[PDB]
């Protein structure tokens, strides 16, 4: 027995509401019967079936979902996209052993909404520790295209920082931002301005949120 | 309705044995197949292998040898065990439900061996590295404005090791606009994250918040409020 390997794509799909996805999955040999299978993955949860036997939706499965294929072409479609809908979904064949595909991301396009930026100084408790974190946070914008800049002194800060994106929101499709400036006490305190310069094409301009440090 | 709890040792030391148990609950063992199954960044979701009530096995090919999957069909238990883990053994792994059975005529089949419900998996790190229980720092508002209308506060939960990490607000209390980010892998070996929620900024001299951390690796519980900033 060998592994059938199992090929998505595409890769990214990005559609409105009310857009119908058409996903594919490629199997490397012929898959079996109707031996195929549907998943919808979303963030911190297992894998949850959709469509098993190609096209026999699993229960609470909206009629939007439909599978269909044979051989070696599987197609997943779903028509009237939502905004929960956003996920990654993966194909699985059962005609040999076990194996699934890798997986299209679904993005559901919104109307743009820019971010609102908040900077925060580090705390107290950390700077006893000997070390200081800055961070900067973009809230609820889309879309996920988003740059951010880090001014100390107005020095641009390169390679200096560490930053992570939420998964698209399920129910107002938007993303976040968290970036991190990390710096030592003795280097924190050698500077005095502070600042994160986001831009976002939600904005007329790029906004710059700052504090001075010591001025409390 | 069928639930499947799962649990098991997650961090472990290159060249030991991975042990995971799975209990079925509103279900008969002798009604479907049980499977074992891992997701990794680097290869994606892997049917590691599959039992019966008969204790009849399938393994995934590629895996043979390396682990054994027993089931306890009296307590609705199943387990997976790797002999000897490796590097890229790091997963997060999952029990499933996987085929019906299906009598025939002097013997029982399984037909569409796919997988429904799934365990609330069980995350794996294979490190050498030991368990360091996190710091839990505010990420505190300002008591002026900072946006008139809505206001951000948080927490950094930061150099720790290994995931996961958990965080709610106000022990469970507020939902509503709270963001966890996704951990980032410092220069330093350690992970750090941050939890953030937008609050009306009329609240902040009213509304008390605080963030519960726990970090369960190291048995590290943390409830931090977070106080606006004064100048
Ligand atoms: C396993 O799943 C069952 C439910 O699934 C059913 O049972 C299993 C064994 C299989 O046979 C399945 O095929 C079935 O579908 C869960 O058990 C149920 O739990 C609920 C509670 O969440 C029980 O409901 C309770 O009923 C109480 C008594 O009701 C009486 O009074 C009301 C009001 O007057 C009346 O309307 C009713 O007709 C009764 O006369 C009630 O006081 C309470 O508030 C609650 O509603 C339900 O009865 C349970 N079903 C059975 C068959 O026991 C298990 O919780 C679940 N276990 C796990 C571990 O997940
Ligand atoms: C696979 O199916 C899709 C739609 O179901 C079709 O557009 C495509 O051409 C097919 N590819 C092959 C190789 O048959």
């Known amino acids: 027995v060998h592994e059938i390997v199992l090929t998505q794509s595409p890769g990214t799909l990005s559609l409105s509401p009310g857009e119908t996805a058409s996903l594919s999955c490629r199997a490397s040999?012929?898959?079996?019967?109707?031996?195929l299978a549907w998943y919808q993955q979303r963030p911190g949860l297992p894998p949850r079936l959709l469509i098993y036997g190609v096209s026999l939706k699993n229960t609470g499965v909206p009629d939007r979902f439909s599978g269909s294929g044979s051989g070696t072409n599987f197609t997943l479609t779903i028509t009237s996209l939502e905004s929960e809908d956003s996920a990654v979904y993966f194909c699985q064949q059962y005609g040999s052993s076990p194996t699934f595909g890798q997986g299209t991301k679904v993005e559901i396009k919104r109307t743009v909404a820019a971010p609102s930026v908040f900077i925060f100084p580090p705390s107290d408790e950390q700077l006893k520790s000997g070390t200081a974190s800055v961070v900067c946070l973009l809230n609820n914008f889309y879309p996920r295209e988003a740059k951010v800049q880090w001014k100390v002194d107005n020095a641009l800060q390169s390679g200096n920082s560490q930053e992570s994106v939420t998964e698209q929101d399920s129910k107002d499709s938007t993303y976040s931002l968290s970036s991190t400036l990390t710096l030592s006490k003795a280097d924190y305190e050698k500077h005095k301005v502070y600042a994160c310069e986001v831009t976002h094409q939600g904005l007329s301009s790029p906004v710059t949120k700052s504090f001075n440090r010591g001025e409390c | 309705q069928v639930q499947l709890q799962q649990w098991g040792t997650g961090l472990l030391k290159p060249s030991e044995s991975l042990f995971l148990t799975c209990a079925v609950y509103?279900?008969?063992?002798?009604?479907?197949?049980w499977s074992w199954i891992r997701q990794s960044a680097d290869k994606g979701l892997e049917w590691i292998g599959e039992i019966d009530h008969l204790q009849h096995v399938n393994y995934n090919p590629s895996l043979t040898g390396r682990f054994t999957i027993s089931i306890d069909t009296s307590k609705n238990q199943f387990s997976l065990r790797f002999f000897s883990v490796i590097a890229a053994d790091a997963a997060m792994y999952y029990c499933?439900?996987?085929?019906?059975?299906?009598?025939?005529?002097?013997?029982?089949?399984?037909?569409?061996?796919?997988?429904?419900?799934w365990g609330q998996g069980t995350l794996v790190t294979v490190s050498s590295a030991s368990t360091k229980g996190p710091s839990v720092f505010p990420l505190a508002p300002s008591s002026k404005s900072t946006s008139g209308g809505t206001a951000a506060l948080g927490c950094l939960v930061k150099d720790y090791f290994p995931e996961p990490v958990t965080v709610s607000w106000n022990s469970g209390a507020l939902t509503s606009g709270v963001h966890t980010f996704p951990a980032v892998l410092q220069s330093s070996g350690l992970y750090s994250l941050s939890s953030v929620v937008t609050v009306p900024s009329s609240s902040l001299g009213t509304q008390t918040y605080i963030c519960n951390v726990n970090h369960k690796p190291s048995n590290t519980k943390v409830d931090k409020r977070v106080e606006p900033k004064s100048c």
């Open positions: 499933a439900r996987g085929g019906r059975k299906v009598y025939h005529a002097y013997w029982t089949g399984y037909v569409n061996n796919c997988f429904d419900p």
């Open positions: 509103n279900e008969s063992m002798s009604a479907f197949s």
């Open positions: 040999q012929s898959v079996s019967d109707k031996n």
